[PDB]
Coordinates of N, CA and C in Angstrom, one line a residue:
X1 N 0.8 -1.3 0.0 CA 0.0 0.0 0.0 C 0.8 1.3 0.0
X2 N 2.1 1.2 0.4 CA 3.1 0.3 0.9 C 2.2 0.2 2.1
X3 N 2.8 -0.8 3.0 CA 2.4 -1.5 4.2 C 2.5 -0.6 5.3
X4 N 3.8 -0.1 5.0 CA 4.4 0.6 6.1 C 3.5 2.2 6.0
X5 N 3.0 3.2 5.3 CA 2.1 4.4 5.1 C 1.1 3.9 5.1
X6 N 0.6 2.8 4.9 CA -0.9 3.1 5.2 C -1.0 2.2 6.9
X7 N 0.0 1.6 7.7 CA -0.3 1.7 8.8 C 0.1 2.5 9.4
X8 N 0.9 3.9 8.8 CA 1.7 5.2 9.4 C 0.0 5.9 9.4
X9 N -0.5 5.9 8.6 CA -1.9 6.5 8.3 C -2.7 6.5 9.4
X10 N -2.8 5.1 9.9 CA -3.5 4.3 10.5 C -3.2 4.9 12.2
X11 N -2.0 3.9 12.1 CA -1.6 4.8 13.6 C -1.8 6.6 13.9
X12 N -1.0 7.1 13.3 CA -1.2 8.5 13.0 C -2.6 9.3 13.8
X13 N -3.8 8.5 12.7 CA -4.9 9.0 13.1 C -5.3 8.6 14.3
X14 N -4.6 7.1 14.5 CA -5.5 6.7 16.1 C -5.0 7.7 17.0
X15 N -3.6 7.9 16.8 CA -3.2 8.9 18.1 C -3.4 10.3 18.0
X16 N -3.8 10.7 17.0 CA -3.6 11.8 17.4 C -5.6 12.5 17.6
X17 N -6.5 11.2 17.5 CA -7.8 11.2 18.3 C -7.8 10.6 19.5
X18 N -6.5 10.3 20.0 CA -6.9 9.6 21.7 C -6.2 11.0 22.4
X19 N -5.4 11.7 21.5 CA -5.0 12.8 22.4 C -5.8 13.4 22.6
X20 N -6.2 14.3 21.6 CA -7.3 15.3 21.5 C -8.5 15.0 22.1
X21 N -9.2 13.7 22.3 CA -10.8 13.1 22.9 C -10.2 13.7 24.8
X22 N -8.4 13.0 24.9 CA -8.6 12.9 26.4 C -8.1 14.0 26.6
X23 N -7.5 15.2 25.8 CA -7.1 16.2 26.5 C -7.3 17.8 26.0
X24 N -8.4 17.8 25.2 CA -8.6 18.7 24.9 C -9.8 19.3 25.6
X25 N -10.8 19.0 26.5 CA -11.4 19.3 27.7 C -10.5 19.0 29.5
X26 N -9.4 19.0 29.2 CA -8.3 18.9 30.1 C -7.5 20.4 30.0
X27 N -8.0 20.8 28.7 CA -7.2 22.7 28.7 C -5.5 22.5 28.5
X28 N -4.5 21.4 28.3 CA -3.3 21.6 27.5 C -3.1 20.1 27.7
X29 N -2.6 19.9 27.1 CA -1.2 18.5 26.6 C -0.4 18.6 27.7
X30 N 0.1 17.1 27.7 CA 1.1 17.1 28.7 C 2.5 17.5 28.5
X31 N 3.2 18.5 29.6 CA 4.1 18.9 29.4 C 5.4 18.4 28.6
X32 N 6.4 18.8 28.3 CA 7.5 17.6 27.2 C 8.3 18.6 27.1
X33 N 9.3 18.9 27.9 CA 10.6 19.5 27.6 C 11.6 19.2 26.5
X34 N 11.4 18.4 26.4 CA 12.5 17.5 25.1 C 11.7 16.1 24.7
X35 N 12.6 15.7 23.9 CA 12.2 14.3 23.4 C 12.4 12.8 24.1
X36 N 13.2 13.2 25.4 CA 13.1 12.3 26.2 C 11.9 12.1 27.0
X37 N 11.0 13.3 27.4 CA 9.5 13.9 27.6 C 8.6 12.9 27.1
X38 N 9.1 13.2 26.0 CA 8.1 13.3 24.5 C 8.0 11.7 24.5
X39 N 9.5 10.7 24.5 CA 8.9 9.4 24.7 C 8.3 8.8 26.0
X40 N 8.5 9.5 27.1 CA 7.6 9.0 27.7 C 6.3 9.4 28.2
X41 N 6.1 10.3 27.5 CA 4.4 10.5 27.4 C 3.9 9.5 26.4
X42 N 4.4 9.1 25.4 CA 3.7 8.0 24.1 C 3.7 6.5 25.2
X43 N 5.1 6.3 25.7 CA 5.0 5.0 26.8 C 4.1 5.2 27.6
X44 N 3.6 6.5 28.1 CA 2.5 6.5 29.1 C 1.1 6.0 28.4
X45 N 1.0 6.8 27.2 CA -0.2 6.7 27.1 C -0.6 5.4 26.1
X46 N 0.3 4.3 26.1 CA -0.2 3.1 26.0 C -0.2 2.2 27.2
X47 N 0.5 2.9 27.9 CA 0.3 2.1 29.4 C -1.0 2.5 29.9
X48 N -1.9 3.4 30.0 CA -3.1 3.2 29.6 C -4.4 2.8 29.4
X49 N -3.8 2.3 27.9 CA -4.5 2.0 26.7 C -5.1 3.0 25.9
X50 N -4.8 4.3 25.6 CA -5.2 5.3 25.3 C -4.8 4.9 23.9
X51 N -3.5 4.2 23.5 CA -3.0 3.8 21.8 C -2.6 2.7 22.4
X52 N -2.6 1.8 21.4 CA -1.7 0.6 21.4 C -0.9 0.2 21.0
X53 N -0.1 -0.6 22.1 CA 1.3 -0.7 21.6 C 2.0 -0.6 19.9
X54 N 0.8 -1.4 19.4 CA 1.1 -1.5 17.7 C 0.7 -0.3 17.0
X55 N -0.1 1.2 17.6 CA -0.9 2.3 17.2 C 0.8 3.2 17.3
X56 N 1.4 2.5 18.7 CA 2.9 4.0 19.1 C 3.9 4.1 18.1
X57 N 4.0 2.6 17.7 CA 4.8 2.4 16.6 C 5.0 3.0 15.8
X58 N 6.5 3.8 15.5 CA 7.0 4.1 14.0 C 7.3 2.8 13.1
X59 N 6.1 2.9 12.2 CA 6.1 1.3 11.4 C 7.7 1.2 10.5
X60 N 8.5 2.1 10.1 CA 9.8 2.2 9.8 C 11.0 2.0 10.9
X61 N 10.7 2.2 11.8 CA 11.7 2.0 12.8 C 11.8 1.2 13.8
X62 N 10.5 0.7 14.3 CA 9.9 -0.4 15.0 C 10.0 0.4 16.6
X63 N 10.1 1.4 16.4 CA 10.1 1.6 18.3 C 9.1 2.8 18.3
X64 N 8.7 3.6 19.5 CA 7.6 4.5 19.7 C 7.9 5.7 19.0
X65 N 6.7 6.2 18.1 CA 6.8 7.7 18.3 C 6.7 8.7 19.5
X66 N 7.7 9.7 19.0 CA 7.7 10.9 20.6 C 5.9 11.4 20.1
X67 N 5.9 12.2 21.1 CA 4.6 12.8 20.8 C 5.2 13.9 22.0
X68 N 5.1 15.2 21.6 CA 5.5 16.3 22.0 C 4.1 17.1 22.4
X69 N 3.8 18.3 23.1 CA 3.7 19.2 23.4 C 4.0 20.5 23.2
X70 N 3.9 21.5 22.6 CA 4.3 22.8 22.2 C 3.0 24.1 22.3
X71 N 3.9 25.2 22.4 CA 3.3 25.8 22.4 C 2.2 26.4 21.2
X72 N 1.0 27.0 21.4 CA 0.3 27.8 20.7 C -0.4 29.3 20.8
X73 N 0.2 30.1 19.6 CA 0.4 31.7 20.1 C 0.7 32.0 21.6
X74 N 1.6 31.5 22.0 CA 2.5 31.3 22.8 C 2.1 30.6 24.2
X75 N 0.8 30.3 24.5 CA 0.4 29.8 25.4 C 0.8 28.4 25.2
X76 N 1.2 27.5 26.7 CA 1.9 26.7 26.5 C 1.2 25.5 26.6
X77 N 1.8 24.2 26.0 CA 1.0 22.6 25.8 C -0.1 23.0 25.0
X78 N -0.7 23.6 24.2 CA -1.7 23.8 23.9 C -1.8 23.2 22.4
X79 N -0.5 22.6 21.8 CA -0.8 22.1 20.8 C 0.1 20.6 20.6
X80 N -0.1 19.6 19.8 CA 1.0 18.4 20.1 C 1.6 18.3 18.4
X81 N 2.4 17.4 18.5 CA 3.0 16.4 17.3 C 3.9 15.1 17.5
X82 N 3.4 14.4 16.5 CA 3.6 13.2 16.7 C 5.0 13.0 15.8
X83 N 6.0 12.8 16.6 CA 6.8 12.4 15.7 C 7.6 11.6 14.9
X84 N 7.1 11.3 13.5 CA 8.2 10.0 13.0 C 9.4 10.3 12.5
X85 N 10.0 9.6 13.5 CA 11.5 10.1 13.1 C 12.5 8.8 12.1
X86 N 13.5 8.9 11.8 CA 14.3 8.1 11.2 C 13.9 7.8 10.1
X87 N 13.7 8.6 8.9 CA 13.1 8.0 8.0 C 14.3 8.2 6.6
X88 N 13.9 7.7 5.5 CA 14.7 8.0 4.3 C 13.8 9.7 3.6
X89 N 14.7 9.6 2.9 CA 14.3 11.3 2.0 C 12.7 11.1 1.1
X90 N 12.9 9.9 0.5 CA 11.8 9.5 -0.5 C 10.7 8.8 0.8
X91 N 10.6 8.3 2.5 CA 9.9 8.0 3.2 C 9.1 9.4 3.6
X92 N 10.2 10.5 3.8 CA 9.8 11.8 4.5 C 8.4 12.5 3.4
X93 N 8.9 12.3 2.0 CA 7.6 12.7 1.2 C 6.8 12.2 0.7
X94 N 7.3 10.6 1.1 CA 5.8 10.4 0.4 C 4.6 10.1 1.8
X95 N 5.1 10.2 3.1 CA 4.0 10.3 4.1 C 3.5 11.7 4.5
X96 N 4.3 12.7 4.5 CA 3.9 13.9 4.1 C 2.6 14.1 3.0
X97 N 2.9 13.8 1.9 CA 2.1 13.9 1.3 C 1.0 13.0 1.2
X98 N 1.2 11.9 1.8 CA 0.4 11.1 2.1 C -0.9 11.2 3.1
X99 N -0.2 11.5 4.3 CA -1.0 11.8 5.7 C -1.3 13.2 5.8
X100 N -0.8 14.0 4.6 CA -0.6 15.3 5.8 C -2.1 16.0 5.4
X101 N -2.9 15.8 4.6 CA -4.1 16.4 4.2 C -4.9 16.4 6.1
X102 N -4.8 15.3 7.1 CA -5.2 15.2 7.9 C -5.1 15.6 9.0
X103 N -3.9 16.8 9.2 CA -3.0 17.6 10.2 C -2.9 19.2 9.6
X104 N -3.6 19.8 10.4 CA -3.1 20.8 10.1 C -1.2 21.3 10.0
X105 N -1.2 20.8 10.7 CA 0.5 21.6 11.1 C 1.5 20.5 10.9
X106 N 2.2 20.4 10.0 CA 3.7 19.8 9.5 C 4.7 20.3 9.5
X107 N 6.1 19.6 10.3 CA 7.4 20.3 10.6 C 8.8 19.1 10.0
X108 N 9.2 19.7 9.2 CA 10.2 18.9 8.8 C 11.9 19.0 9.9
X109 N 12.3 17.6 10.2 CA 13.7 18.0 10.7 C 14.8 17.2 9.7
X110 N 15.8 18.0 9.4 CA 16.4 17.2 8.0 C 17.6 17.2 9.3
X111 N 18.7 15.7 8.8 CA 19.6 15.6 9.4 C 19.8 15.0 11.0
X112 N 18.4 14.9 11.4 CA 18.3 14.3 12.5 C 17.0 13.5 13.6
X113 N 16.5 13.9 14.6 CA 15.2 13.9 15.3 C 14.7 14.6 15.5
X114 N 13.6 15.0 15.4 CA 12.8 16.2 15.9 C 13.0 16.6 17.2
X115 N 13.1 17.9 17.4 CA 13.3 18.6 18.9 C 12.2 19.2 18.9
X116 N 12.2 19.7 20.7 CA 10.9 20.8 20.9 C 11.8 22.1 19.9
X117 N 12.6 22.7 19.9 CA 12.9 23.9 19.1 C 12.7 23.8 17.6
X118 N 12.8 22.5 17.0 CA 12.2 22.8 15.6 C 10.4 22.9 15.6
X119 N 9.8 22.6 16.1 CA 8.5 22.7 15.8 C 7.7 24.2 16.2
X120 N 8.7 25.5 17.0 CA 8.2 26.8 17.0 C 7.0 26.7 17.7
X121 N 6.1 27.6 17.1 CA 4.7 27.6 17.2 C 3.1 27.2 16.7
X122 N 2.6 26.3 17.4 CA 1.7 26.3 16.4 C 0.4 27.0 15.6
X123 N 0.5 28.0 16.1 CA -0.4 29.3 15.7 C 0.8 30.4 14.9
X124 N 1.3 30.6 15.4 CA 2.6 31.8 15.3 C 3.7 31.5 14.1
X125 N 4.1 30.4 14.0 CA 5.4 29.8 12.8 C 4.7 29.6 12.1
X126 N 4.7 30.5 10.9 CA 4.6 30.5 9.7 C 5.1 30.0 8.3
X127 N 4.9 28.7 8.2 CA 5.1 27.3 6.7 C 5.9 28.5 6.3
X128 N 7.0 27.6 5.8 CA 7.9 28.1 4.4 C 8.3 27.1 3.5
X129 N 7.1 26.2 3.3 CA 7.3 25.2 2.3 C 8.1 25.0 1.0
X130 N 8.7 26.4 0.4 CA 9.3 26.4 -0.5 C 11.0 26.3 -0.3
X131 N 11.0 26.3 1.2 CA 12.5 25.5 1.7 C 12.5 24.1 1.9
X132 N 11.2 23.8 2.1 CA 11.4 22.2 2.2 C 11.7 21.6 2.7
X133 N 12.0 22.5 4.5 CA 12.3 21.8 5.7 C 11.6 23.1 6.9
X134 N 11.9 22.6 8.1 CA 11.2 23.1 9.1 C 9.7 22.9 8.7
X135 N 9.0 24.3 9.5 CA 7.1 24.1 8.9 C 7.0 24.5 7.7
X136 N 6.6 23.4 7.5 CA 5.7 23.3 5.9 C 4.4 23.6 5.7
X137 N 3.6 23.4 6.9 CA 2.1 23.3 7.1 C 2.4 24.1 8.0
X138 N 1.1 25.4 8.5 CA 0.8 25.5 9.6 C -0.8 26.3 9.4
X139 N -1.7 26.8 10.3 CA -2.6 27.9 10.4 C -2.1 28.7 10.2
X140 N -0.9 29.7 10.4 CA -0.3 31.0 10.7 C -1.0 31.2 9.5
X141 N -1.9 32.5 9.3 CA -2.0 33.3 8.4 C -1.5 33.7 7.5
X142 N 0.0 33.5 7.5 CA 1.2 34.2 6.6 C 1.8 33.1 6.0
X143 N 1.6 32.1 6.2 CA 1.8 30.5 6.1 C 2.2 30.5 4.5
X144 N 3.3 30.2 4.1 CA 3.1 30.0 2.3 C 3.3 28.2 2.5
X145 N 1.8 27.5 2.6 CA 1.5 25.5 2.7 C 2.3 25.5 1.8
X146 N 2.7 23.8 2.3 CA 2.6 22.8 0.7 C 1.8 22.8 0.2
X147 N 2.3 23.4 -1.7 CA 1.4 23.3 -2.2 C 1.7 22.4 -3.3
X148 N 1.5 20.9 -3.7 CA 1.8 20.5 -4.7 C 1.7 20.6 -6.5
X149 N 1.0 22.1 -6.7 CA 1.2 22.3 -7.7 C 2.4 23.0 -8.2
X150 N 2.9 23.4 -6.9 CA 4.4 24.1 -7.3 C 5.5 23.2 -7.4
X151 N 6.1 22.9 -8.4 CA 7.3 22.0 -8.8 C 8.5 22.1 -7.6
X152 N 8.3 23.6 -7.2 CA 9.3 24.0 -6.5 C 9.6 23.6 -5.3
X153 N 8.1 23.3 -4.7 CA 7.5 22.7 -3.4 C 8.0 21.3 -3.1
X154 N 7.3 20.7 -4.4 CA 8.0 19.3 -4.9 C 9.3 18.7 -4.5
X155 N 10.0 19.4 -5.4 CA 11.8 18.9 -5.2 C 11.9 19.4 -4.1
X156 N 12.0 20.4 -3.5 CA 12.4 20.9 -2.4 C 11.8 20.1 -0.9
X157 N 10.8 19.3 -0.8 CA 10.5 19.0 -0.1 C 11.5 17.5 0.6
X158 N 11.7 17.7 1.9 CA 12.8 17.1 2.4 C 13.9 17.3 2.1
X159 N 14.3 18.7 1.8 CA 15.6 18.7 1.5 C 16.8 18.3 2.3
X160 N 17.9 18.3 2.2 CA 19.0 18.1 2.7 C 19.3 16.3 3.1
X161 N 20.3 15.8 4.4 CA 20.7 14.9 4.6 C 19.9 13.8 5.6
X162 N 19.6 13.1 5.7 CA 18.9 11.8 6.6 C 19.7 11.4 7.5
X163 N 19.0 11.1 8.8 CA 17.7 11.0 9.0 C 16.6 11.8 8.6
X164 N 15.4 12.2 8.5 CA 14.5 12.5 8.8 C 13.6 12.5 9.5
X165 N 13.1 13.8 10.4 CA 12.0 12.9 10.9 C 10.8 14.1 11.4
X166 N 9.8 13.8 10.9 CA 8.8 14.6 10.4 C 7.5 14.4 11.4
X167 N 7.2 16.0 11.6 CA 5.9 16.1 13.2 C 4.9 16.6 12.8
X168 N 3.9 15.8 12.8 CA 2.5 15.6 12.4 C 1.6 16.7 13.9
X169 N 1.4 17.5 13.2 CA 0.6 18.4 14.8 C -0.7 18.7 14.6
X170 N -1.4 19.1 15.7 CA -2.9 19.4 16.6 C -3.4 20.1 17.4
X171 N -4.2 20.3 17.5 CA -4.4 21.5 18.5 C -5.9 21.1 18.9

């Protein structure tokens, strides 16, 4: 389908509806200073059952997605992303373009793992998709999305060296 994006699909959506169902009348996400945070909030919340072990999984990497916390227009935990990290250059676009119709907010990290400093803000950091890394997607009004009719968008998208690893966000 490949196997591996349409269970990235799959997982993807489960988590990022067990977040939002259990914490968005809770008023913010749980806190995550870094990505050490970040994995153990995703271990938490299948300890749970909130996702399942097989839902946390980066189907490319075989171990948990972080799932972070960030800010929105600067108020804090108010928004999340899920992050798949470790991926190839041709993995980074085609789940992007694959999943991302269903996320508002996409953050590219080229060359490594996602941190809380690459993902900014999720109201405030304004997509510059035509670099083809950092936010690609966001709400910001000033946002220039992916837009796939731009060739430019295209090639450029994931640019630079691998790893990759790409944060699927919510609010």
């Amino acid at each position: 389908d490949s196997q591996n994006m349409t269970k990235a699909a799959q997982s993807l959506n489960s988590i990022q509806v067990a977040l939002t169902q259990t914490y968005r009348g809770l008023g913010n996400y749980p806190a995550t200073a870094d990505a050490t945070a970040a994995s153990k909030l995703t271990s938490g919340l299948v300890s749970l059952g909130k996702i399942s072990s097989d839902e946390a999984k980066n189907p490319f990497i075989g171990t948990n997605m972080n799932i972070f916390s960030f800010p929105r227009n600067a108020a804090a935990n108010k928004a999340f992303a899920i992050s798949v990290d470790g991926l190839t250059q041709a993995q980074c676009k085609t789940l992007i373009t694959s999943v991302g119709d269903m996320f508002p907010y996409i953050a590219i990290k080229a060359g490594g793992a996602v941190a809380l400093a690459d993902l900014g803000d999720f109201e405030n950091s304004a997509a510059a998709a035509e670099t083809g890394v950092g936010v690609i997607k966001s709400i910001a009004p000033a946002s220039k999305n992916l837009d796939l009719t731009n060739i430019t968008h295209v090639e450029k998208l994931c640019k630079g060296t691998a790893p990759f690893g790409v944060a699927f966000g919510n609010s």
